[PDB]
Design a protein around this nucleic acid. Sequence first.
RNA 1: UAAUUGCGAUAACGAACGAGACCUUAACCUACUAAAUAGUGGUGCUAGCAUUUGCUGGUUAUCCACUUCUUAGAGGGACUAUCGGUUUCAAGCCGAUGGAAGUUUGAGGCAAUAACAGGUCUGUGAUGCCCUUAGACGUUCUGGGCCGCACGCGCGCUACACUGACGGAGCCAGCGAGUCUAACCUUGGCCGAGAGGUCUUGGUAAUCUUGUGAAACUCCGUCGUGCUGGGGAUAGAGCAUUGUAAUUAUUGCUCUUCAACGAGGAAUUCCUAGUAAGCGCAAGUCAUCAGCUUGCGUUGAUUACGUCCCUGCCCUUUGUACACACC
Lengths: 143, 54, 141, 63, 56, 145, 55, 70, 63, 206
Amino acid sequence: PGVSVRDVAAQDFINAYASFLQRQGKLEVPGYVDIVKTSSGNEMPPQDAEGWFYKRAASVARHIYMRKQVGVGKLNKLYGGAKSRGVRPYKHIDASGSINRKVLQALEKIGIVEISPKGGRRISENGQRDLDRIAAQTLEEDE
Amino acid sequence: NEGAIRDKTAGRRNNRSKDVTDSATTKKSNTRRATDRHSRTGKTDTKKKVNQGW
Amino acid sequence: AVPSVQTFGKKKSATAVAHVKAGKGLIKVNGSPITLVEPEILRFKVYEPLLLVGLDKFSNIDIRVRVTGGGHVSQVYAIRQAIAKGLVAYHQKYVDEQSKNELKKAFTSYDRTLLIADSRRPEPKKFGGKGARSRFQKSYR
Amino acid sequence: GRVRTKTVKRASKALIERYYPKLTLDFQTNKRLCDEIATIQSKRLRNKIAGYTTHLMKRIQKG
Amino acid sequence: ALISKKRKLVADGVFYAELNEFFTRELAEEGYSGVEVRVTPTKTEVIIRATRTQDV
Amino acid sequence: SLVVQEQGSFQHILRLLNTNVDGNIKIVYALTTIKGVGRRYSNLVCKKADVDLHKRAGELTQEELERIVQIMQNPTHYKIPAWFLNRQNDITDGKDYHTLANNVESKLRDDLERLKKIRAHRGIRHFWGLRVRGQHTKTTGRRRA
Amino acid sequence: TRKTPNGEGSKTWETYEMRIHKRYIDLEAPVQIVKRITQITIEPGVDVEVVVASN
Amino acid sequence: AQHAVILDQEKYDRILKEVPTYRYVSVSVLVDRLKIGGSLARIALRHLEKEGIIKPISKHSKQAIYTRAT
Amino acid sequence: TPVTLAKVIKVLGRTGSRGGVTQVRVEFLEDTSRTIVRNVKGPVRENDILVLMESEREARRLR
Amino acid sequence: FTPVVLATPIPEEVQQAQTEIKLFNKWSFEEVEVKDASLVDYVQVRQPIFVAHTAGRYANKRFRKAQCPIIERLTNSLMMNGRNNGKKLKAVRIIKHTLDIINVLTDQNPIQVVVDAITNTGPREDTTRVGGGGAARRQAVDVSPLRRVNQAIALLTIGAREAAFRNIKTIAETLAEELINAAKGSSTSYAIKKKDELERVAKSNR
RNA sequence: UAAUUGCGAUAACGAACGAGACCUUAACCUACUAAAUAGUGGUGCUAGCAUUUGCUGGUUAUCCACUUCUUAGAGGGACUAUCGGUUUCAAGCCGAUGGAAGUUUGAGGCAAUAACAGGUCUGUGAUGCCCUUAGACGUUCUGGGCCGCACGCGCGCUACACUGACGGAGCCAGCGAGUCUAACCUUGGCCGAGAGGUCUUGGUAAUCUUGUGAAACUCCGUCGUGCUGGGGAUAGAGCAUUGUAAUUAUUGCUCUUCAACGAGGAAUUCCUAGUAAGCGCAAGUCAUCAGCUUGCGUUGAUUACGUCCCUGCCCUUUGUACACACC
Ligand SMILES: [Mg+2]
Ligand SMILES: [Mg+2]
Ligand SMILES: [Mg+2]
Ligand SMILES: [Mg+2]
Ligand SMILES: [Mg+2]
Ligand SMILES: [Mg+2]
Ligand SMILES: [Mg+2]
Ligand SMILES: [Mg+2]
Ligand SMILES: [Mg+2]
Ligand SMILES: [Mg+2]
Ligand SMILES: [Mg+2]
Ligand SMILES: [Mg+2]
Ligand SMILES: [Mg+2]
Ligand SMILES: [Mg+2]
Ligand SMILES: [Mg+2]
Ligand SMILES: [Mg+2]
Ligand SMILES: [Mg+2]
Ligand SMILES: [Mg+2]
Ligand SMILES: [Mg+2]
């Protein structure tokens, strides 16, 4: 009947795309994974410890598909959260500009996003191709 | 500084063992607020000087 | 150039806008079917207008809604309103009046403020406290 | 507490005093009447006066 | 030149105030009563509202 | 996940690095009772020792535990970033260390005494049992010692 | 700003404000009328600025 | 650190022979039987669901609901 | 227990120095034609129904 | 129920119970009758709703507070004690969680057990601090039905909030438990105890 | 009645300042005038998934049209309307219908006469008088201090957790501000775990930062009641930024150290609806520094809709030897 990613539930679409990249292995995972903390405003690193980068990448990829173009600073602000400054009140804090920038690289080398004009990054036409593909596969779990 | 650490009668331990002077938990002491309408000048402007000016 | 109307609905800052043309019965919100909105505990909140009037009445029309401003609840009360205000505006110009009057009747009888936009609004903070009516703490000495 | 002041009631009295061959029970035409017959400076003020000329007119018809 | 519109109008307001002060001190014995400034091309005009312009 | 069914092999409290550790608590957190290792440091070490985080300290075949120690007391050789460690750019030899359970009490004195012995204000401030980091001392800190 | 010059008394605050209204109107005209429309219609109180073509 | 952070084969069979007659069985319900702590209780809820014994009626974290088999 | 059901007839006034008490006359729905004035605690209006836990006892002004 | 599927499909179990009986989350709104003379006209059921979340103006008039769905009145009183101020979406789910638990034990629509729990813990009569001069005795009074419903909600939710505090059981589990024990007064519930001990003190001043 | 706001009684009759009116702000317009710096539909141009026409995007001008949403001009709208209760059937008040709105519509601004030995000579090149005026109480330069710590008091901040922390994931505001003779707000690309660095760029601004993707909150897991993974004081070691200068540690990051605090005595503050509380954000200050303030929006209750018991103040009545008026 036709499909996009907008027809799939926001959460479990990523959980299938996350499980996809793993099942694929063409990743370019930096290597400082399992020790990086994804934001200054966090206490502990991600609990996945083999993964969480496919999820971030899948999350990143889906976000850039939904709009015109996004940037490194734009993903630092998006995935950022509240940092408990100990005995002092909370403030918003941006996330690591290196995890995201290396997601924008490891997904562009893999063919899901291109360095768009106007600045930022655009969803590659082959990315729409792959994104709409596994999105339709999700609706076959509830068929 | 060489004498600053040497000096006994110094540091928390010494002050902690001395009684807290009662002058700490005092009051405002307020020193003349209920005498505010009673002129201490003792001068008192005269009625002629007021009628000359007003 | 097909028969089409456009309506809206505003809850406390958020304005949901809805274009209602003649179609084959789709209801999308900013990009996505109404079956996804996900605060998801209020899913039936925005389903409500589709059920007050019946699962039909949409098989000839298409609705699409975009929501700017507001908050994660402020907008959900806007889209349900812009949906029902449009279904009742589409019968204003393209169907007969007595059918349109039957819709406002079946809507306002239940009416979690479906056609009628709530007037409540955040009240200005006055100096002397952290809130609108809330005052600071005093101690008397 | 919507107690109308004297300027309202003073104007309302003075209008019914001399314009009963006008000024029916309908505030709407009474409002429009005031802007043709009286010089009021505020849309709000005029509606207050006309609404009260309308309260008095209603009860004059009744003792 | 090259100002923001916000800073511009505020800066123009200060110029009126300071201009007014300098006249209220300088033109007392002449019944000074205010000024206005007209910003045109080719000119910037100042009118001295003083009850006695023979001395001004 | 899965239902595990182990035999008497699993054992409660086990001793390493001169301290005691509860067997029946998760090992990433079980290691933290050692003075000098926290939640971050523990988590990276077990990720390096090819150890299952979902296990407890009571499991972990004795080779896993012995490996865990070897990494902790030599993080710079086992690829740990040298900004992860409690004592780097040392003030005598320049080397980067990670002082552990009883040693972390030892190096606090060595530092504190270095400041005192030098008569630096920070050391003088320590010797008086005061706050050093520059906080006001008028209103806070009344019970301590 | 607090109304008080000093610090005594309850803390009365006081907000001043100044409103800026900006209008722009596009015209396609020859050299004469623009120079005639700008030499007159001047007004003390209205900042008039006349920019030129679409770049 | 008090009784049933671990597996204990006798406890495993205790679970199988006791989930019957639990009209309500959840994370807190498994702990109240002088037995499995909340961590391994949230693992038992998926194993007792691998086949039969418990019927999922609730959804998610912070609140589980199961009922006897039918 | 002799559960007694009585319906508020009239709202009289606020008793109690604090005021949070209201004097109210009630009529029982089981064998009406007798009325008794009772003291309430919560907010009350006409045609409410008070569950008087003792049938024959009434009170008046409070301090 | 004569199904219909347009372009963006509406699910079956969704389609089904909606234009049918306009029931709760998935619970029957009919059949629920207040087992007591009054506190009808003060317990809402009929008119029915879908979830207990409503942008209603139950405040700007004295008695219009009564018209709020009693289930929603239950939720409102859940979201409090400071850290839970606001956060209605939280308690909304806690109620849905709770009703299933009430459903699980001892059948009978939980929207009916809620009606039972409320009507069983509202004190019929109470006392008040009458001055009398210095040595203030206690005057017995008959608390109105509106206060009987309000205090029933406050007592129930409080009883569950302090019980669920610092313990493995969740709010919904204790909330259900309290409502379950309060269906028919079990003498082992926080609300029944405080209700009876208010009519106990009221009885000793009569 | 919120009100010397009114009705009514009336040797008074009719009036003005102050209240009200008014003004600003937040609400209602498919009615008027419009808008490439605001946005919608259609058409080109365009990519993806489906094919049976479809669904979801890209394209500061490739054109056509429009003004619902946005914007601000001129108008309109409410007058407590209709009806019914209640009352001297007076002012009014309460209920229902309608309505964008019916608590002075909500929130403010302005605010008479008079009083105080209230505060401010440390805002002023406002000022009387007095002191001082070259070894200066002028002024500038260097350093220190206003932060100093046995303790008493006040406003706050963060918490004692499982309506929770933590980790992933969803992802939504509003009030602002932002660089000329200059270095302000800053997108984007790389380098870096982080803090940040480096190369460029848009913006004197509805145009660029910015849709300020803010925070609670929603979602799936990890933890299990244990001072525990709650809590983050204290403290050691390291790296950066602001600045001429950071030591008594301006700030930021990292690892480590992991205190008190198990809901708090007598007492006491604040508050009635988009309010309380929870939650962050912008602005002020600002080279750097918010645990402060001024505004803003987000999530959004419980309970009153009463009375004079406590307290505070107004009103008459009354006493007075007080009128510099009980200091
Ligand atoms: Mg996050
Ligand atoms: Mg965020
Ligand atoms: Mg440790
Ligand atoms: Mg318009
Ligand atoms: Mg109405
Ligand atoms: Mg004085
Ligand atoms: Mg002065
Ligand atoms: Mg100096
Ligand atoms: Mg100071
Ligand atoms: Mg203060
Ligand atoms: Mg979280
Ligand atoms: Mg490095
Ligand atoms: Mg430039
Ligand atoms: Mg912590
Ligand atoms: Mg701890
Ligand atoms: Mg408490
Ligand atoms: Mg600032
Ligand atoms: Mg300050
Ligand atoms: Mg006398």
